[PDB]
RNA sequence: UAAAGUUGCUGCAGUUAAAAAGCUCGUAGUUGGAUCUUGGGAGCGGCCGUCCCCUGCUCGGCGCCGGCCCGAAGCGUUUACUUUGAAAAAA
RNA sequence: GUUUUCGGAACUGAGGCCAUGAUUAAGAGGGACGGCCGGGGGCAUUCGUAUUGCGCCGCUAGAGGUGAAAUUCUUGGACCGGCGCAAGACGGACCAGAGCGAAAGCAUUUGCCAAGAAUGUUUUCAUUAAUCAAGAACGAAAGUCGGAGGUUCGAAGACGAUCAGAUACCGUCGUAGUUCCGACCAUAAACGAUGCCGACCGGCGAUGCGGCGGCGUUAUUCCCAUGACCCGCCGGGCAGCUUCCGGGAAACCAAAGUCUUUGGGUUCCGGGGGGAGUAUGGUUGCAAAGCUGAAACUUAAAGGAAUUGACGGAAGGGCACCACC
């Protein structure tokens, strides 16, 4: 059924560490145990193994990512700023 | 022409005769019977350089296909990755033709 | 959208007659519009009018006098009695002399007074005068 | 006016009163069903035919030449498809501004737009159901719709 | 006016509506049988045609769809079905 | 209670007097185009005004000789509507 | 006693038979297709001067700001002139009673992405529609939360003026904010103080978009189709002017009309002024606050539109040594 109504994984800290940092806190612990869609097989089985390491259980394919997320917001534009760079540079 | 190869495909799933997956079509290319063969942008580039090899010694064309298993898949009307596909009958479909 | 015939055949015929118009043109034709006029048409309120039968709802030109007040349609369709009938032309008609109420019934479409002498009530349409 | 827009415009078409077939076209019933057919084989929808034929053959109407209706006459030999072409098209739509929903997050007309027309195939699927051409089973999800695009 | 005929319109006027506001509504198009010298038969082409139209045997593309009437290729005769 | 058309079904208001949700979607609710036996006959009232019709296969006769039809009854798309009758304590 | 005959009940195999069966294609709606069009939306890119800051060079006594000053910067070179450089906002004039969008709203170039109206159509399905408690998406500005950024402007704050005081108006500084990203809140004179869909009822000239037809001018010259003008037509749209249509308390409104000659369908919502969007319950939000929301008690008016007069530190035109020069 519904557990509990508004706390979602951030149940485990019960009534420790303040209502706001729990709240801020669930946003991070959501997506840091997500499983992501590989891009190299396809399969839903991309898991963080360590800080920034993400690991492909069937591909056997380990990616330098994120801390918490698979793509950090700043190293997506970046690849998309040295795309263009060396688009708009060796011309 | 990204649109149309989406509906050649729907023409050829409904009417054509062909095989999904890998090893089943790597047989269909030695029996003569492939006229066509589709990857996914996502095909491990040692099965990409293997389907290739094996598709300019019987003479027949490859489609490198604009995405991935899961996009091929949903193209063929199926509910799982696709990544090789080989058009035996291209049935009532013009996909050889362009 | 369009979800009574009457109502705006009978008040696409009142302002053209108030403008002063000697005919009218009105778009979708019906049965009860034709049994409507034709009951109009016999106590002498329009002059004779002619059907365009297109291959859909037809359209149809009357031919106005300047004799009509108003015509009125009554939506929704009060299934009336014959003592029900009595109330319903003293707050519909100016006088006990001329103006009817076409009310719909087994006998066919019929003013008050055939309604009474046919001993057989029904549902209202509207009035005219 | 229109059903998800505040515009109203008369554009339709406007059929001719003479129902009989002209002196000119010599085709006959057992001619154009033939090639209607051939049309229907290549993966066209009724309006797609119905098209082509007043284009390069000269049939002002299929149905006034022949006894019945394009649709009709595929389902009466076993070539009509599934469910009818009218909704393919409005889950084909749903499809590609989804698609454009999870590439670009902030477009918020886009997202108004989905809903408009999300709540259009509902319409249509609720009509299907009531005159029996879609199993009562039938209904549309939004992750399951790429694969019966 | 007051006394304008709607039954009898004048011919002036009948032209001069939306195809729907008629009497009797009609299609402001025709079917046209269509030659050009490179083709032999003279095809049964749609006013506002829509698409591209071809010969038999590739003679050339005869005509080609605008937002209203459709558009004929540099000296492709058209005459008007009159049924 | 009437006057109260100042609670409105008959029968009110909503630019400025009191008042239309900031916008659109949407389920109940409410409401939904046209289309299907129409004319004409037929005898008798006085050119017109009523009766009857585009229906069928247990039981009596005006009967004839496995039968030629009219008289009573089991029957024939469903409902709303109207019309009449039943049945409805007096006070 | 049996095949019976044959009364009833169900099952099974053929060929004939009816004129053998599906109304129409709405100035309803959805859907397709065609060439278009638009400051409609999203992502990226690209440009423009200006403002402030820095460095260098020039010549110099003030510059700034005001009703008049002062705070403030300056012989340590301020303001001004010239070369650069840096970062962050903004999108001038063109820009209109023009366009698009559901509303909020939207304007530098180019590309990519998905969408939409109108138009045209002898295309398609055949009533699939209209309005909608509950419910859902978007919702300016301000404000709240986490990250990046900060030059202009600038709540609070500090001072200088003014002043009878002026914790205001004026001026010099300025913090949050103003900018970008990811969540929040859900209101505005969110206005046309005007629900939506449909029907009918006067002209006139423009305007935008699409289509159609027609003297000619003009460019592509090498003529046609097309681009730019000219004269009409049709449809949809933002609007004008004009009528004793008609209505309205008038102001005014081609709708605010077709209404005691009262009935097309339907949602919301008002009941004299206050107390009061208050108290209290419930619910939503991190908060600020939102939505639903009385009563006791008080009061003969509060109010809308128009008229005339008076009045103005309102405008235009005159005048007077009981006014000035």
Redesign the pocket.
Known sequence: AKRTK?VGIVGKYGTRYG??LR??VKKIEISQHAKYTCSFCGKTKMKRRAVGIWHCGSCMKTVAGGAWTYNT?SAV?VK??IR?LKE?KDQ | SLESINSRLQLVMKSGKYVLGYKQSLKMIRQGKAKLVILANNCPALRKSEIEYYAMLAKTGVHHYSGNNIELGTACGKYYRVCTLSIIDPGDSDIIRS | ?????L??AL??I???E??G?RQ??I??????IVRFLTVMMKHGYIGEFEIIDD?????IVVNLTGRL??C?????R???????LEKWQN??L?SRQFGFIVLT??AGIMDHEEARRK?????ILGFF? | ????????????????Y??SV?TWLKLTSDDVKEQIYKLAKKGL???????IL?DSHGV????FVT??????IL??KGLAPDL???LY??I??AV??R??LE???????????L???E??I???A??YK??RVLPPNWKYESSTASALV | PLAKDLLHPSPEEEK???????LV?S?????MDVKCPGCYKITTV???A??VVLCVGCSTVLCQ?????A?LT?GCSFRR?QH
């Open positions: 508004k209502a706001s709240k801020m917001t534009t998309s700023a263009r708009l | 959208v369009r979800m009574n015939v109502a705006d008040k696409s009142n302002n053209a108030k403008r118009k009218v043109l778009r979708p034709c019906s049965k009860v291959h859909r709802a037809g359209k007040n108003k009125g349609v009554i939506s929704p009060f299934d009336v009695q014959l003592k029900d707050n519909l100016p019934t087994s001993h057989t009530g029904g549902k005068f | 006016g229109r059903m998800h827009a505040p515009g109203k415009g008369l554009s339709q078409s406007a059929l001719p003479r129902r002209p929808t009724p309006s797609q035919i119905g098209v007043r002002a109407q299929v149905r006894g019945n209706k394009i649709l009709r389902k009466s009818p072409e009218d098209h409005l084909k739509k590609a501004v698609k454009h590439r670009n997050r902030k477009d918020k007309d886009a997202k108004f737009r809903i408009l027309i709540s259009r509902h319409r249509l609720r009509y009531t005159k | 001069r509506k939306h195809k729907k506001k008629r509504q299609p402001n198009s025709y079917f749609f006013s506002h829509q698409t769809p605008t937002g209203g009437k558009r540099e079905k």
